[PDB]
Structure 1
Amino acid sequence: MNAPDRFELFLLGEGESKLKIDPDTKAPNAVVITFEKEDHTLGNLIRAELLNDRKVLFAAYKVEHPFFARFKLRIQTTEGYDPKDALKNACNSIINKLGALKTNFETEWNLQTL
């Protein structure tokens, strides 16, 4: 009766960009991206992979309220390394592990019985 529709978790709305990038005012060379219509599924995956990049000083995400499918990613990189690239290499890195994971699973499946 006051409930939001359930598509509102994955469907974007009236002029809501998927990513929103803002210059962090606190620490230098840091940025805080807002991910509309996403959750711990994404955020935890991006933040954990950003932690493997050794030119990333800081990386953490957070769902400010569970009512809303959205989350903030905060990223700080070493001087000269633009944080967006830190995000880009991060995503790609995941995609490559995932692909390898898929094929590796397939070949394993193609060897079974029942």
Structure 2
Amino acid sequence: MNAPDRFELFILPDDVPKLKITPDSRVPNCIIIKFEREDHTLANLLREELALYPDVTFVAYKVEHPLFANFVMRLQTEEGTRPKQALERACASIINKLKTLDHKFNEEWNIKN
């Protein structure tokens, strides 16, 4: 009776943006990113990719409630670098890693078949 529709976990409403970025003025060069219709699958990947960058000084995420499909990320970088650029570099790096992983898997599957 009060159960939400299951497609609401991944279908984005028209008036709800996929991504909202606000600065965190408490510390310098920090932003707060709100991801809509996402969960731990993207969050943990992005967090542990960003945590290995020398110019990233802080990265974390939290899912506030399991009944709502969203998470919020906090990202803080060095003075020279901007946090959004670090996020873009992380996304590109993971895409490249997945590309070479898929290539090697296809090669090995063709070899063994």
Normalization by structure 2: what TM-score? 0.97
| Cα-Cα RMSD | 0.8
Three-state SS of the structure 1 residue aligned to 2:22 is: coil
SS in 2 for 1:2: coil
Aligned residues: 113
Alignment of 1:94-105 (within 5 A): 94-105=94-105
Q: Name the amino acid aligned to 1:49.
A: E
Cα distance between partner residues in 1 of 2:97 and 2:25: 34
Aligned to 2:74: 74
Calculate percent identity across the aligned residue pairs. 58
Aligned AA for 1:105? F
Corresponding residue number in structure 2 for 1:38: 38
Matches within 5 A, 1:6-25: 6-25=6-25
d(CA) in 1 for partners of 2:48 and 2:40? Answer: 11
Give per-residue Cα distances to partners, 1:3-43, cap 9 Å, x unaligned: 11011011011411111000012211100100000000000
Query: How far apart are the structure 2 equivalents of 1:49 and 1:4?
Result: 33
Distance 1:14 1:8 in 2: 12
Q: Which runs of 5+ in 1 are unaligned?
A: none
Cα distance between partner residues in 2 of 1:96 and 1:24: 30
Structure 2: gaps spanning 5 or more residues: none
Q: How does 1:84-103 map to 2 (within 5 A)?
A: 84-103=84-103
Runs of 4+ aligned residues of structure 1 deviating over 6 Å after TM superposition are none
Aligned residue number for residue 107 of structure 2? 107
Give how far 1:61 is off: 0.8
